[PDB]
Design a protein around this ligand. Sequence first.
Ligand SMILES: [K+]
Ligand SMILES: [Mg+2]
Ligand SMILES: [Mg+2]
Ligand SMILES: [Mg+2]
Ligand SMILES: [Mg+2]
Ligand SMILES: [Mg+2]
Ligand SMILES: [Mg+2]
Ligand SMILES: [Mg+2]
Ligand SMILES: [Mg+2]
Ligand SMILES: [Mg+2]
Ligand SMILES: [Mg+2]
Ligand SMILES: [Mg+2]
Ligand SMILES: [Mg+2]
Ligand SMILES: [Mg+2]
Ligand SMILES: [Mg+2]
Ligand SMILES: [Mg+2]
Ligand SMILES: [Mg+2]
Ligand SMILES: [Mg+2]
Ligand SMILES: [Mg+2]
Lengths: 169, 58, 215, 296, 159
Amino acid sequence: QNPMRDLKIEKLVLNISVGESGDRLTRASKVLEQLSGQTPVQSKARYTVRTFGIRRNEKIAVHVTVRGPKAEEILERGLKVKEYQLRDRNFSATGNFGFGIDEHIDLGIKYDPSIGIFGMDFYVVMNRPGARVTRRKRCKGTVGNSHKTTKEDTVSWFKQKYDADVLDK
Amino acid sequence: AKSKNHTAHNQTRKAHRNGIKKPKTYKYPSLKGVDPKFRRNHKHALHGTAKALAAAKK
Amino acid sequence: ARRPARCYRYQKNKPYPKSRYNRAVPDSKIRIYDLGKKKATVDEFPLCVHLVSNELEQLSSEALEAARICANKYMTTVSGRDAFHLRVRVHPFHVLRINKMLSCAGADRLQQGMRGAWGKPHGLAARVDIGQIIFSVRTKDSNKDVVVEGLRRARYKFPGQQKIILSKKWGFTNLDRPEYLKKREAGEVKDDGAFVKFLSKKGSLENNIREFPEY
Amino acid sequence: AFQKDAKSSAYSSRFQTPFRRRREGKTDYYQRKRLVTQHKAKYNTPKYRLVVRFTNKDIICQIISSTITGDVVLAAAYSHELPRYGITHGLTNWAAAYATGLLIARRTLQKLGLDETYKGVEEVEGEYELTEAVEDGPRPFKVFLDIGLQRTTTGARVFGALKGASDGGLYVPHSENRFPGWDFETEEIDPELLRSYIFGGHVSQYMEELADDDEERFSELFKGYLADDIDADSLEDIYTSAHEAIRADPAFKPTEKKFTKEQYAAESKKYRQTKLSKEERAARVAAKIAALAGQQ
Amino acid sequence: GKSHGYRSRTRYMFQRDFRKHGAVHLSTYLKVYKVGDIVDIKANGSIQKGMPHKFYQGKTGVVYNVTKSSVGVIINKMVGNRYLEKRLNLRVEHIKHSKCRQEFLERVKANAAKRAEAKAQGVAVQLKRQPAQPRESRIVSTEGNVPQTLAPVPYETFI
RNA sequence: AAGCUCGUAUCAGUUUUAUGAGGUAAAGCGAAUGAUUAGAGGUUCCGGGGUCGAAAUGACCUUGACCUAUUCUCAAACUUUAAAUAUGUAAGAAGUCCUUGUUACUUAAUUGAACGUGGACAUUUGAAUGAAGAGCUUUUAGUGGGCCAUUUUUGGUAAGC
RNA sequence: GAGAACAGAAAUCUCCAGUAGAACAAAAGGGUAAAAGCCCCCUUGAUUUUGAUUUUCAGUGUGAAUACAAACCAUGAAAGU
RNA sequence: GGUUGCGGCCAUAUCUACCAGAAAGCACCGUUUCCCGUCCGAUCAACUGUAGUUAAGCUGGUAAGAGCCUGACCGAGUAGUGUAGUGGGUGACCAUACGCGAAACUCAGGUGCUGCAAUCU
RNA sequence: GCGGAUUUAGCUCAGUUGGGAGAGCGCCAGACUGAAGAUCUGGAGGUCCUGUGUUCGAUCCACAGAAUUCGCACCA
RNA sequence: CGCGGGGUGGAGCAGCCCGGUAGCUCGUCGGGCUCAUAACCCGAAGGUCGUCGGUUCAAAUCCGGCCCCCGCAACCA
RNA sequence: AUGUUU
Ligand SMILES: [K+]
Ligand SMILES: [Mg+2]
Ligand SMILES: [Mg+2]
Ligand SMILES: [Mg+2]
Ligand SMILES: [Mg+2]
Ligand SMILES: [Mg+2]
Ligand SMILES: [Mg+2]
Ligand SMILES: [Mg+2]
Ligand SMILES: [Mg+2]
Ligand SMILES: [Mg+2]
Ligand SMILES: [Mg+2]
Ligand SMILES: [Mg+2]
Ligand SMILES: [Mg+2]
Ligand SMILES: [Mg+2]
Ligand SMILES: [Mg+2]
Ligand SMILES: [Mg+2]
Ligand SMILES: [Mg+2]
Ligand SMILES: [Mg+2]
Ligand SMILES: [Mg+2]
């Protein structure tokens, strides 16, 4: 009994946080460009602390945001890697959820040593219709409490759809 | 040898011996800092007013 | 050595606390301000006695520590460690300065006199007004003489005049004893720690129902 | 509730609320100050804004001056008045914005007695030009464009309304680099593309493409056009006739206002909750307290 | 060394009236100042341009010039044993219309009306203000107001 | 000192009325910042340790480190608030009101701005008190080591510092 | 604060809360939230002429600053700046 | 009286938690050829007003609500302070006389008002 | 008391630009020797003089001290 | 300000004095000889010539600015 | 050419 409080995928962000900025970074950018079908964005480092050799504004990561049916397809493809089993702790309090895969080459294109191996980070942001209220320029507002996404709502939606399951508390 | 540095002692008495005089307001005050565009137009307006008043004294 | 307290008895300077602009203040001699049975409930100690200043002056942290030690030791010896709760209600936040002038023959030769005389931190003192409470001690009504004598002993450690006053309040609360009794029998007082919380007729009814089940 | 919701008493006490229309996300006061602030050496001259606002399903085009008591509308035009001039569909598109700007310009000139002089651009061809002052005559009515919070983009319907108001005879200072048809790679505008957008050429071309393509989309979109038997090639003459009728009679015939304001007020007053009095609040508090005869 | 800058000792003078920070409301810019208008000077700390010197905070003067965003104000400054004419170029955010003469203008209109009605009805004007006069005789009744006798209270501590 | 122009008179180390400005005294810290005392309840997912736990924080003992509601005491270089004294301006004819002339300024526009012509209003011409009058000018002496008293106040233990 | 492979207590990605508790070259104070902060785009008003004004003040100088005028520009859709 | 565009004062307007909303309006909402902008039509742009919904925004109500606002022979004429004495007191400081006069606290009330224009069961 | 300096593994020291705690002599272990010394390899060794704050972190950017010392301390 | 000279492997120098092109010694490492060490013998590694720009069928070199070091000489706001 | 002790 809910007209348009239908939880749906707003976006899926694929992330490759490489420890360096060498050719591996370009290869990772090409990797997450291939399945996304969009030009990715380079993420510069903000500090130079320790243990990574990363420097201020070194372009150490690369990410891409996918929306709509392409995002849903990529989400299902990365879910088949995790065998449709995600931990409960994988679900955030605000109703989004994520997971990490390694050895991405097990789907789509093969090893291709010109490209190499990268694990990738999936994060899915979940909301309802009317999320524009918080993002539009004019009359920007806050989504009401009953319309906000919760971790329980996202867990229930994620087990209803994909016929998946969650794990221990 | 050190000496005194500053004091306002007796200064008000000195000022009030000849008094604090208000600055003698005049009608038609000076147009020193008035906007020069306004002043330029005011000159022509006053010239036209003077000529009109002279011509109209028949 | 330490200068005599007569040199810093009076509030001659503006308050000069340890701050961003001092950074070099020695530690106060008194570090403990609550002693005795400081965990006792408000119901346990109805009788409150105050050692109150009758002068505008400065009490050194050394004198505060000496008087606290004297009063606590006397009342502990006579009535027991847990027969009272003594609270020092003045904190030595004002820093005293000293312009150190080396004492020896020929000091004028290697001294600048009054040039650059601004002093270094010498100690700490509490600035008390007339009628300001210095010591508060709550206890049972039977321990009145012991408590009064303890504060009388502590008074010898302070400069100036101090008065022993029996408070009309219940313990360390701001309520006169009949009013506290009425509130307690009406159930609008809940023990929180060594102090109590009072039920107000304002705020959320759900919270005023949860706390203070006086309904 | 949450450890970050239900902010603390100190935070609430020290919170300074923005201006109400800034909290509502409606007024950009930084821009409004510069739009409204008059040269002090005029001492009464209002600065008229051509306020153009786009809601869903409607376009608001107002001419507004500022006072201490509040803003005062000199003339207002809406895109829901375009059916009177022969536009019944696409009431928020570029051509509707142009028509509304032309209507507000003509209505304001008629109100100010400046309609015969400053006829504007009667033969619109998409050429960039401002309403010039006539020689030895009153200067054209000058208004300044007020987008509001809408973003300045090359092709915006807000600049379509600007173009329509400028063509209507109002002097609205503007450049041509925000009109549809401006080539960002160079410094010239495309007058044919601007005229096409003025007369709905982009919408007609979309209609033709959708008809020559999958008909389900052309049946869902433009459904009212089919039900009104309006062809894509008819849009240019529809908007030309609308411009002619606007120039012919921009006199703001208002709605007949059935259900007079008093019965409107009564009907709305039926469906409104009233504030409980202090006696009722105390009664509810006493009832809630007496509910705990024991403890629930 | 000593420090006397342009904005020296203005730390609290030029503050923003706690919980009234941010943008200046539009009535300040919609105010109209004519030459001869009397204005009070109060610097707005958020507008750093056209700002008056700290000496003129709280000073009341007369507009002598009107520019695009500012007015010229005439202030008589006490220098030594006399007053010197100072001309300040102040943006409108730092001034407001003075109400030191609104009461005078309303009294002027009321006096004109009273004089006209006097010369229409009879002969009585009394158009000058008068200081608060001594109270006239009055009779104070005890009906329901019988005097209650008070006494000084004895000393007690209640601490 | 010399005076000069006037003297229906002008103004004032003062009050009153009206209207501003200030951030000191006080006050406040269950209000921001910085200090500061104590207990209480939640945080074992509190940082955890002891001890088991075959081991996990899992069961406890519990040192904390936070959060919540309280609590004692403070600030020249803290503050929501905020005096008293002191302080700016105004209390009219150089005013008010009505009509309309100039402009190359300004307005969409005789629109506004400023300066005007003409007309009307003297018992209190628009608070109090006072006024060996007011205003103005020139030219010159000496002085340019200060000190004391009440009150506010800085350094200093203090000083006839 | 809650979430994601390596990746932990600091890397990158996401959401929520967040009156400024950040940042604005430097000392401190004031000021600033669709900004004065961060990023991006275009630029040279850090230009010309000579006056007026505020502070310091003798109402001198110097420094600094304010508001105009007469030009030429920059920017923006524009008001403006 | 509701709603919208522009607003004035800028919390009596804010914040938290629930509830309700007829009509219209607003809104969410549907699409990507065109102008335009993005990693992503999410934002921004354009198109449709059609496919749907009041779920959210928004509005209003509720709450011994937080905050905020107002008032008080509430605290308190208290603190402080101008003026006075060959007043008290070793002093610290204090009292008195003629005046001005808080803040905290407590209690009570309140929770946007309003301008222009348009529109509405 | 003033004006300065330095403080780093047991010893001498290098850091230092918002690098990163390191090198010799010591010690240990293994080589070599019949066995020593000498050499030759490898390793450990500091919570950078103490405490508090500002930085994304910190000897190093960065406050109050503590220790060790050098120069001056004069005219009667 | 002026005139000059110098900067080259970790260190000290040549090659520069007109482009045919980076070398000598010490130092480091590996091996060889010796019972072992030094000398000795054979290898390897080490600058691309103080920083940029300029002219050259292909410049450390020739030219012009600039950084550091030294000598001499000069000095009205 | 040199190679220290027992
Ligand atoms: K004593
Ligand atoms: Mg002397
Ligand atoms: Mg002297
Ligand atoms: Mg002192
Ligand atoms: Mg001597
Ligand atoms: Mg803007
Ligand atoms: Mg202030
Ligand atoms: Mg500036
Ligand atoms: Mg001050
Ligand atoms: Mg104080
Ligand atoms: Mg002399
Ligand atoms: Mg901006
Ligand atoms: Mg200077
Ligand atoms: Mg969309
Ligand atoms: Mg849009
Ligand atoms: Mg609803
Ligand atoms: Mg409340
Ligand atoms: Mg006397
Ligand atoms: Mg032997």
